[PDB]
Amino acid sequence: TGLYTLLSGVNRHSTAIGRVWLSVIFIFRIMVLVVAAESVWGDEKSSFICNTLQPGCNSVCYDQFFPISHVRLWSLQLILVSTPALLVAMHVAHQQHIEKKMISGTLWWTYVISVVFRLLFEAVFMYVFYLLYPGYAMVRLVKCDVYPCPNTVDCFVSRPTEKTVFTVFMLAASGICIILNVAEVVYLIIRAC
Amino acid sequence: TGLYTLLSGVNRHSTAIGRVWLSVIFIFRIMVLVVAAESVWGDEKSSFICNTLQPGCNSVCYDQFFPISHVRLWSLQLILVSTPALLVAMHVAHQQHIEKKMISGTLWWTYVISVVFRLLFEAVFMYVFYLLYPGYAMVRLVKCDVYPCPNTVDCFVSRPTEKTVFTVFMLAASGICIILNVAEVVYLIIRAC
Incomplete structure (x- = not known):
């Protein structure tokens, strides 16, 4: 769990929101994704x-209707969201090593920039999910007319309802994370002045 | 072949057209139908x-696109066309038997009425064929959307070209028969007065 809290973005300048709430939601998303990846x-x-x-x-019909699976989208989103946190951690380690072998404002600015980048990544992944799959619900039957299928054919999806439930869970978690990141940047700016 | 000429409508009041030309076309249609019935x-x-x-x-698609086969239509047409000729023949046999056990105008009127009925039967069968199958040609691929087929499906016909050839033969023979019957009634009316 320590690696997960490191990937969340816990920093010495982090307030309560970023230290105790954001990390828990990150771990929750990781656990739900692990549960739902290959089971459903x-x-x-x-x-x-x-x-x-x-x-x-x-x-061809499967490729037309599912350009990229939901699980792969969520995995990419988690990786990209966790990247800036470990970038900041490696920068801190580099600074400490430089100090050992021989300011706070740089750390503060790096933290706020990383939080902004996390917010941007979450927002863009939400938008791309909205573009690819406008409805949160998955349907049982789809109509396909891509070559070489003649005329229009009926195709059937596996486990639409369970996938809908897990999609709702994941979208709610992502929205909560976005709100918490916005609150974090606003709180840091307020504390600055 | 004598039974075929009897079924054609050969009568003692028949002219050359009804005695030597109509019967040959009738036998030709019979032979072509016998050749093409079960082979193709x-x-x-x-x-x-x-x-x-x-x-x-x-x-369901076969029933939708072929309500009645061409061969069965031609068989029914031949039977109905040959019916009045044998009706007249049985009437003549009855008259001769009555004469044996004990006029010409009755025979003449019966002959003209039978020719008119043959013309009517040929015309109505031509019209019903035009209604069911507007084009003389048969196509390779048809589109079917009858329940329970989902959406529209492609279906494929057996031997379209050979069936088209035989259809052309049969339609030409029927048209020639219609023209000959009209000529027969006109010639009989002219000879009457």
Whole structure:
């Protein structure tokens, strides 16, 4: 859990919000993703079937309707969100090593910049998820007309309801994280002056 | 061949047109139908296939696109066209038997009425063929959306080109028969006065 709190962005300049609340939500998202990765999204493509005899229609329809899986999007989002925290940690380690082998304002500015970057990454991933999948709910039946499928074919999705439930959980957690990051930057600015 | 000439409508009041030309066309139609009945229309339904996994779609699509086979239509047309000729023949046999056990105008009127009825039957069968199958040509691929087929499916017809050739032959023969019957009634009316 210590590695998770390090990846959250806990810093000596962090207030209570960033130290005790943001890290817990980060760990919660990690745990939910670990639970839901291969249990419910494991057979997304192998169980995807269409009512046709045309060879190759299943694969092209699956690629058309799922350009990138939800789990992979959430994994990329978590990696990119955790990157600035470990960047700051490595910078702190470098500064301490330089001190050992031989100011606070630089640390403060680095912390606020990293928080802003985390907010930006969360916002852009929310926007791209909205672009790819406008509705939070997943449907049982889809209509596919991509070549080589003739006319329009019916295709069926695996576990729509469970995927909808986990999507709701993940989106709520991401929204809470965005709100907490905005509160963090506002609180730091207020404390500055 | 004598039975065929009897079924054509050969009568003692018949002129050359009805005695030597109409009967030959009748026999020609019979022979072409016998050749084409089971050779080319035999596998019309068993070889009819559609690109789908839906059970029962082949049968409903075949029934939708072929309400009655061409061969059965031609068989019914031949039977109904040959009916008045044998009706007249049985009436003549009855008259001769009555004469044996004990006028010409009755025979003349019966002959002209039978020719008119043959013309009407040929015309109505031509019209119903035009209603069911507007084009003389048969296509390779058809689009079917009848329940329970989902959306629209592609279905493939057996031997479209050979069926088109035989359809052209049969339609030309029927048209020639219609023209000859009209000429027969006109010639009989002219000879009457």
